[PDB]
Amino acid sequence: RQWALEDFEIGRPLGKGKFGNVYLAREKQSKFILALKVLFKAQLEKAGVEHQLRREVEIQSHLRHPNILRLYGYFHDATRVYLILEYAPLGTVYRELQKLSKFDEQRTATYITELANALSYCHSKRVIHRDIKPENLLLGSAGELKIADFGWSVHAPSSRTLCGTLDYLPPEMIEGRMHDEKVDLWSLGVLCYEFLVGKPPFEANTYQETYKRISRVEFTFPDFVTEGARDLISRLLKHNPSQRPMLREVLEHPWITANSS
Ligand SMILES: Nc1ncnc2c1ncn2[C@@H]1O[C@H](COP(=O)(O)OP(=O)(O)O)[C@@H](O)[C@H]1O
Ligand SMILES: [Mg+2]
Numbered sequence: 001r002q003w004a005l006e007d008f009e010i011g012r013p014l015g016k017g018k019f020g021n022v023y024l025a026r027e028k029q030s031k032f033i034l035a036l037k038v039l040f041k042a043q044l045e046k047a048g049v050e051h052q053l054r055r056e057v058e059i060q061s062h063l064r065h066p067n068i069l070r071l072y073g074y075f076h077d078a079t080r081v082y083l084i085l086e087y088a089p090l091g092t093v094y095r096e097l098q099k100l101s102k103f104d105e106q107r108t109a110t111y112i113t114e115l116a117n118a119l120s121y122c123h124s125k126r127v128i129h130r131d132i133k134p135e136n137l138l139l140g141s142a143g144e145l146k147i148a149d150f151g152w153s154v155h156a157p158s159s160r161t162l163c164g165t166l167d168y169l170p171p172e173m174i175e176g177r178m179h180d181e182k183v184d185l186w187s188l189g190v191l192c193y194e195f196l197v198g199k200p201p202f203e204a205n206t207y208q209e210t211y212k213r214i215s216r217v218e219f220t221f222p223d224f225v226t227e228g229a230r231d232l233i234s235r236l237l238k239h240n241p242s243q244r245p246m247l248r249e250v251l252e253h254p255w256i257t258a259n260s261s
């Protein structure tokens with residue numbers, strides 16, 4: 001299926017990516033609405049992450065799950081690569097958080113459940129996402145959560161490419177050790193905290209300070225966080241990955257059970 005730019009009407013920018021913007025688009029013959037993720041070849045090769053784009057396309061295009069953003073295909077011209085994505089109409093969880101400041105236990109527990117199901121599907125194929133953060137979690141038309149942006153994804157066992165914000169990454173990842181599916185379990189913990197609290201647990205004004213905080217696993221909870229939430233988060237944010245629970249154990253955690261829709 002050989003798409004070209006001329007097959008689409010392009011609309012407003014949906015968001016700012018690292019290598020270009022994502023655009024709302026409509027396919028001219030079908031009137032199918034979708035999102036077009038633009039990446040400038042010059043910038044990709046300079047950054048030396050052409051392998052990340054390849055992985056994104058190959059991994060994301062084969063995954064089929066209601067809580068994973070579909071990638072339908074891709075094309076390119078002289079200066080740009082274009083990923084054809086499922087359009088997520090309700091935007092990002094990042095925007096949702098900045099709108100609401102923090103989520104109640106019901107919305108949080110529900111998003112964690114959707115995330116845990118999507119991750120169960122991924123890990124079953126040994127695909128680890130490694131970049132689960134609010135800006136890569138999109139919302140479908142029913143408000144259902146969708147994992148997107150599989151550029152950091154890899155098949156497990158893996159090493160690590162250079163980084164960005166460290167906030168959502170486990171110690172093994174930042175330190176460049178070998179790592180596996182348990183990476184995403186840590187990230188789930190960070191997200192549960194951020195959804196409840198409004199900021200990630202290792203937030204600091206410096207990368208170096210964040211790194212220290214993550215490596216020592218130093219975080220505390222505001223008083224409003226409940227004991228069930230604390231219990232879940234404390235179980236997920238373990239320095240030793242082998243001590244992190246399996247996703248099954250998260251899905252059946254009493255706090256998740258009592259609060260998830
Ligand atoms: N399919 C989509 N539907 C709606 N918005 C999207 C979609 N895909 C990406 N976006 C928006 O564009 C931003 C960047 O997209 P992303 O795929 O994460 O690029 P990058 O790999 O550079 O992070 C997202 O954080 C989101 O705001
Ligand atoms: Mg992204």
Ligand SMILES: [Mg+2]
Nearest residue numbers: 149150151152
């Ligand atoms: Mg990306």
